Amino acid sequence: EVKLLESGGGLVQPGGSLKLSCAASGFDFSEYWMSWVRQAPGKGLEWIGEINPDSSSIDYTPSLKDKIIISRDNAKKTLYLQLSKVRSEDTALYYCARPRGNYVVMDYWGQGTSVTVNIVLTQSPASLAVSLGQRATISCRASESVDSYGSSFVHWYQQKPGQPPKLLIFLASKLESGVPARFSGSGSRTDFTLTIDPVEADDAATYYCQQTNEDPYTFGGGTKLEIKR
Amino acid sequence: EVKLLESGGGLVQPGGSLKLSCAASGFDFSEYWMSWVRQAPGKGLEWIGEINPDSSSIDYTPSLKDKIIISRDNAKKTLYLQLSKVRSEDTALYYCARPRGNYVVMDYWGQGTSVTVNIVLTQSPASLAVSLGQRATISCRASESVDSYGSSFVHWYQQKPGQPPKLLIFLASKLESGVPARFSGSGSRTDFTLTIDPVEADDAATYYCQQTNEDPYTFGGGTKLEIKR
Amino acid sequence: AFPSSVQIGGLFIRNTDQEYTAFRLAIFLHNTSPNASEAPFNLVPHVDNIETANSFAVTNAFCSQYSRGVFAIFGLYDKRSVHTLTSFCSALHISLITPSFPTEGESQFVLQLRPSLRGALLSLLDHYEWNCFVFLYDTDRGYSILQAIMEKAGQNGWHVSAICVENFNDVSYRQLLEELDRRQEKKFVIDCEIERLQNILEQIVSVGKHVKGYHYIIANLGFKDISLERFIHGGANVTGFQLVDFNTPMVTKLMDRWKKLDQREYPGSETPPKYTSALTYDGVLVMAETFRSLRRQKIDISRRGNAGDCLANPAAPWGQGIDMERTLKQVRIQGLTGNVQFDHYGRRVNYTMDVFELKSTGPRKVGYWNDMDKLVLI
Amino acid sequence: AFPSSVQIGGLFIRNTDQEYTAFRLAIFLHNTSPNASEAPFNLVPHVDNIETANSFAVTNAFCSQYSRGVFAIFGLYDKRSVHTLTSFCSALHISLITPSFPTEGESQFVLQLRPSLRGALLSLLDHYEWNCFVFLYDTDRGYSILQAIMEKAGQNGWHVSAICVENFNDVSYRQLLEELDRRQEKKFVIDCEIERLQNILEQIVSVGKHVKGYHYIIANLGFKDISLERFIHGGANVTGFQLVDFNTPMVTKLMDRWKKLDQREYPGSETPPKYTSALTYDGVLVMAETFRSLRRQKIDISRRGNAGDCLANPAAPWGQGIDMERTLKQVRIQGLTGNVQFDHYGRRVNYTMDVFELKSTGPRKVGYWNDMDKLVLI
Amino acid sequence: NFPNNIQIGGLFPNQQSQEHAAFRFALSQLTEPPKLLPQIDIVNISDSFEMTYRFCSQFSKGVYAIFGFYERRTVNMLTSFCGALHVCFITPSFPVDTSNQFVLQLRPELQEALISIIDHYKWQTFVYIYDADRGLSVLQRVLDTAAEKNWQVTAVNILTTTEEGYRMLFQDLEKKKERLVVVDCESERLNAILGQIVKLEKNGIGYHYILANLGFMDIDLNKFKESGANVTGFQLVNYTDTIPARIMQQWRTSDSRDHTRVDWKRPKYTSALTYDGVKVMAEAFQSLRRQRIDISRRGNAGDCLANPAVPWGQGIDIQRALQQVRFEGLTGNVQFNEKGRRTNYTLHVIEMKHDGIRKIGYWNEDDKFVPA
Amino acid sequence: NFPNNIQIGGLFPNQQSQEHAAFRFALSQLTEPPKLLPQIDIVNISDSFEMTYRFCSQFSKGVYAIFGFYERRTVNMLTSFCGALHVCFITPSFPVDTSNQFVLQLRPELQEALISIIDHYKWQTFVYIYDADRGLSVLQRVLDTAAEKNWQVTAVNILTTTEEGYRMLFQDLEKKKERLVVVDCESERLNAILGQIVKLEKNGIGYHYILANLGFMDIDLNKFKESGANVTGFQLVNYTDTIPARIMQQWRTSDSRDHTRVDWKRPKYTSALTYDGVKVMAEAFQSLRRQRIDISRRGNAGDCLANPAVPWGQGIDIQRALQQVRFEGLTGNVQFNEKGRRTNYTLHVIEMKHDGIRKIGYWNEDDKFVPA
Ligand SMILES: *[C@@H]1O[C@H](CO)[C@@H](O[C@@H]2O[C@H](CO)[C@@H](O[C@@H]3O[C@H](CO)[C@@H](O)[C@H](O)[C@@H]3O)[C@H](O)[C@H]2NC(C)=O)[C@H](O)[C@H]1NC(C)=O
Ligand SMILES: *[C@@H]1O[C@H](CO)[C@@H](O[C@@H]2O[C@H](CO)[C@@H](O[C@@H]3O[C@H](CO)[C@@H](O)[C@H](O)[C@@H]3O)[C@H](O)[C@H]2NC(C)=O)[C@H](O)[C@H]1NC(C)=O
């Protein structure tokens, strides 16, 4: 399991150049490319930019590309994203993440930090609450193909408010490493279906279904599950 | 050359048995048969008897066979001839002789002794007298075949009065051994011929020709030869 | 309602006119014979000459025989064609018997009439107390003998000089023999083809290694079919194996019928039959026995709907053929090679082999090898 | 007034097809040839095959040829027919030329084309410095070699083991070879017939005496006409004599004409000609040359009055045969075997022979032998 | 002249494999106007009946070149079919001693480099551990060299031996001070073999293991680091050079998804061989198009099983286009001799002695072993 | 049936010889009603043309059996003519190794008695002096025995060597204390050989000559009596037994004078062989007449030179008549085997050493050498 550190979320001056430091501890960007994603409060996450494994070509955001530039060092394993003409709407929560395709254990996003200066899928049921020891099925309908290049290309990531996001299931064939979640895609899955058995108190989070089959991998509305006491 | 001894010629009583001792010194009758002959004074020699080499069968005279019996010992090599009813005419000169067919050296007659109690051949010239160093030819005409069994079968022997006889030539192919006489049978020899070259004083003797082809070998009238001074 | 005339095929390779002659002799004595109650059915082969078999020609022959509607197949394979033909019999459910070298692992629908020489050779090597020798071999008949020799040498500490003579000519043979004589190696085990064995023996007697003091082991099923006359004069240690016993009424009857044969009608009749001809005759005999057994159990075998393409989109197996296979491994005949018996896989059990040693008066029996009593010497 | 067609006869024995074909080829080349000034007369043979030549068949053939009216006779004799035939050519005044073994003493009207091997063998034995060896021989070609070996051994103190192999079979040959090897006798001189020499070499290589350390001397006029291939591999010491040289323009012309031939009309043409065939060809050449020389000296040959009975009450010598006998010894030709020179007796004088030694690379020249310079090695 | 689209067939063993992902990526890397159309098929590596069924089906389809794998059972059948039908075959599987020139082998021979490596260390007595289902040609060469040079070789089959046999072998080896072993098998089986070696018996002093395979870093030799256990291995693809690093970067940063699940594990050399096979096929077809030679099929060829075995006319020209391909790809320089096998290659010899990865020299066809 | 007179031919070498006298005396002894009429011819035993002319003339005259002599030049021709024309030949000359059954040899073989005598005296190194014009079969047997028993034999030909060669041989022999000599030749030549030996060379210390012949007392060896000179000869005819003494006595006392001049003073054994030949011919013809078998000539013999041979039918029976003849003569028992040569003979071995004639033993075919 790789380790990602992202701390120092604080307010910034109006219009000043703000930088967020993200560290890939115990690893390097040479093996897996690092990508930053921008998410707002009560809104889906959007890819703020991507990098290359060899640190050759770096991608940018689909909404505000030229407004932010991210520089990363693989040998130092440290990434900093600077910006110009930062506004109130531009001060979104930028979180780094390691590449999910390298490994399930390597599919560990950063801690994430917020400052105060895509994939179209519908996940149901929006509200879920079951006791410990129960099984629940969540279905996310999508408009694109159910499976891209034979196997499925849909992922579900369970993120909590104030906690680091974790990718529960990836491509319906490789679930989360370290802690194997029972919820994973199976069958034909015209709607991406995940059956969790059992849920726990630590699993009280919103699982957003991002369809990696449709470029790019962006979290949708998601489905929130809790732990009934 | 074999040695023969015959001595003891003397007068005998009327009708008594006479014996002549003939010794074959240095030899034996086993190798060669011994034959005794009888010759009267002024007459040709007649075979008084013949013996065998193995001393098995003994022959007798052709004129008086039963009147005289001759006993010979080969190991002792001694011959003695006894007689019965001996008359004046029966007292003839008895002479032994070794076999002439064994060898020319073995053709040595005995000395011969006289006591006082065939082949038809004409030899010419009867009277011969030449100096030393001369050659003489004598012809002996006969009535039988000139040659018998391939070669000739006539012989000439030179005997002197009071001397032992000696065979000069035998069968016209083997002359006298010891002293090789030049007179020998040669050529076709319708009459027995012998060319003597040269004559000597010791050769003054009468040569009698006997035809061995005509049974038996008996000396004829012969021819007399001498030495002129 | 078993028809009298079956449509059995056959497969033969080059330099196999002797075994073809034996096959035709066996089919003649099966086809025309008295005691019709012992053979109420006729036999007509469907032969195919292959001319130095590769996999393509063998596949074409198998497909032609399948299109012709064969019941069993009498075939021969080399190293490069043992697998695929067997694989065909592993898919089309067509029983097949061979006189070629046995192999392990396949089993199913292929039977091997040639018994394994592994046990007899290992027992003879252990009895002679050999520790250091040269093993000359070829790769044309698998690698079972080489692997067994390597395993025995590893488990016993033997010094085996394994030399392959597949691509060796006469000059290389002479050089190898002289170099081996330089290293004072006088103990040899030779396992090659009959022509290769003849060439090796000819080069050995040409160099002058047939004198007393040299040991040679012939690793073949036949010993009297090899021209071994100069080795008698040289007095070399020669030991071989024999499968068919000539002092048998059945073998001497076949010998009488062989000397009764014509010259040009059946080629190769001038030579006494080898072990392969004996295996071919035993294969025809076991074929007749297994068809009589199929008659006995009152099972009717016919191939009418299963006469389609050689290779189709689905599998097209013969329904009764499995039963035929079940019948063909349960025989108890006595042929030239002795008692012919098989197991679930197909190898031969309870087979008697004779060890022959060549001496001044000629080869003579020393002992016999079975698979229960091992080697017993007389 | 020379007659265009002579009535020449010929005599041949059993196992003489190669020499007969050489004689026929020589007659073919002499008769139908260009340059009629070089050959103004034709030749027709009167050939009689004798079939195991005893004296009666040879006498019958000679009398038949005498009744035919022959002039010169090309004949071959064994040991049992050398004398009487020569006698038949001595009183009857008929010239006769042979490629058979040389003989001394008879001379007169007998000509011998084979050169004497006595001097070359004695010189090679003296050069090799031998003192103890085994002389294997037979009585089929006289006793001159045996007597010469005995005389040389007596004069030099050699240890010669003279063994006759006339009545020896294969088992006796093997027993003799093994007993001789038991006595550490590794030096051999073999002088036998061609078939006997082949059998001796075959038994030697069968026993195993062709390895290095054994010395063999081939006492024959030819060395390349015998099958010597296993001795090359064995590396045994082999030394032999050769009479004809294949690097001669006349010899290679004959070889080129011999390779352009048929089979059934000229049997036994598959091999290069032996020394006897070369001697036959040289005899035909010297026969044509002496007929031309007889034509040159302005003497007319004829035979009409001397054509009566073979065995008559008086002697009937050929009147002009003395001139032919004189002319036969005055030839100065060069043929396949080299310069053909004759003496007052008849044996070939002033000739050349070559010495060959056998090893891995094959036979090659080591030296030459003449009767004037003796043996000279290159 | 040459159509822009041409069909190629595939005899792939499994659909979920790293070789399949490398095949798809290498086919997606094509930009030239000649284009390749894949006709992959998934069958047993054994069971030559199914393999020849698919071969006949693909020949009826009308493919030009076939890329696939085989075992010892089906190598002879594929070689004979490609030599008779004159159909070009390109394979990354093991090479064989006897094969026609119309089959192409991308795996370099390891029958002479192993002998040179053994000669370097002056080995005389050792234990050889071979796999039966791999090919006995290398074992034959080792045995011939041992017989010629008077060596002691203990030849052991992996499937024949067992636990007690391994224990008796190792207790026999431990009695000798110098303990030398060579092994040769595929890395998938070699991983379990090395695990059995490490989790039962402590190696310690000696045990100079020689891993006779084309891939060295593919083997997880982390437990072979505990004590001693000197390793001598061979490597074909070295991921530091400019062209392989660029190619791996393009593979990693591409958006082609690569559907064969995780394609990393330990990059395997078979994926590089598959990439090189696609590269040589594409470049050879491009060069053949550059020469303006007609390769269009004159109708259809449905004669996989027919009594006239006449081959198609231009197949010899297709083989000629394949016996000349040349470029620097993942495995290095690529070249073929007259026999149609891989020649003119360089193997990096890497030896570890309780320290880490260290290269000691390189092997060349003409220069033999050059230490460094 | 059988006519009272039957004609026999003779190939005699010389009219003036002891053999002719013995022939005439033996023919004069015939008193049986079967009478042998003689046709003798005198020729040199050489120039085979003349001798086969004489043979053909005799055959045209119509002889039944031929008695004569042959040498090495005419042995083969006479043997072939008698084996082809089926004419019975009886000879007292030397025996040969190879001959047909229709020729009869009266001289017993000496090739085995000599070897036994040499084995008796434990000879290892010796000089063997042989005559070329006698037959080399005995030399071949001696050489084979020497090679088998590891002997040293110095083979010397009489005509080849000279006086200087004899001096060199004798001065080489004198260097060794135990010098040993074997000689073999006819007695006429052996007399001159022995005179050469006594003329200048010492015949004293050592010098154990072994005279290999059939007549020991034939040779005048009174000069060999000087000192030492031990000689071991063989004798066939004994002039002491009752029957030879009786026949010799009958020869001494003969009414008809014999031919030549002298046939005594050590008479030759060949005369005894001629007497035995006449006796066996007479006994064979008498036994054939007793059996009442027709042997009359059914027409004319014709000539030797005919394209069909056509042998006379009863001639083989004549050979049969020549085979079962058995009695005692001058040479002893006369018996013939299947091959037509004399067998089962007794040879008296007489060895003298400075003392006189003394017999040491005898030789028989079945008993080998029995000393006495
Ligand atoms: C792909 O094809 C190969 C070749 O046919 C298959 O190997 C074969 O598998 C069968 C099993 O269906 C084996 O048959 C049986 O094996 C058992 C093993 O215990 C044995 O007890 C039976 O008597 C029978 O022989 C067959 O031996 C085997 N062929 C070999 C090893 O050469 C392979 O299984 C196939 N793979 C798949 C995934 O279909
Ligand atoms: C009986 O036949 C033999 C041979 O068959 C005769 O011997 C031969 O005699 C003549 C002399 O008349 C020899 O000729 C001479 O040869 C010498 C050799 O040194 C030579 O120098 C003379 O110029 C003359 O040519 C001939 O060689 C010889 N044959 C031999 C020895 O084989 C014998 O003469 C005949 N008997 C009678 C009574 O004629």
Residue numbers in the entry:
A (entry chain E), B (entry chain F): 1 to 117, 135 to 246
C (entry chain D), D (entry chain B): 2 to 379
E (entry chain C), F (entry chain A): 2 to 373
Give the authors' words:
Our results indicate that the predominant assembly consists of GluA1 and GluA4 subunits, with the GluA4 subunit occupying the B and D positions, and auxiliary subunits, including transmembrane AMPAR regulatory proteins (TARPs) located at the B′ and D′ positions, and cornichon homologues (CNIHs) or TARPs located at the A′ and C′ positions.
Additionally, particles in class 1 with the subunits at the B and D positions were untagged by a scFv or Fab domain and thus are GluA4, in accordance with the biochemistry results. We categorize class 1 as A1A4A1A4 receptors, using a previously defined nomenclature. Similarly, in GluA4, H234 and R175, which correspond to F231 and R172 in GluA2, can form a cation–π interaction under neutral conditions.
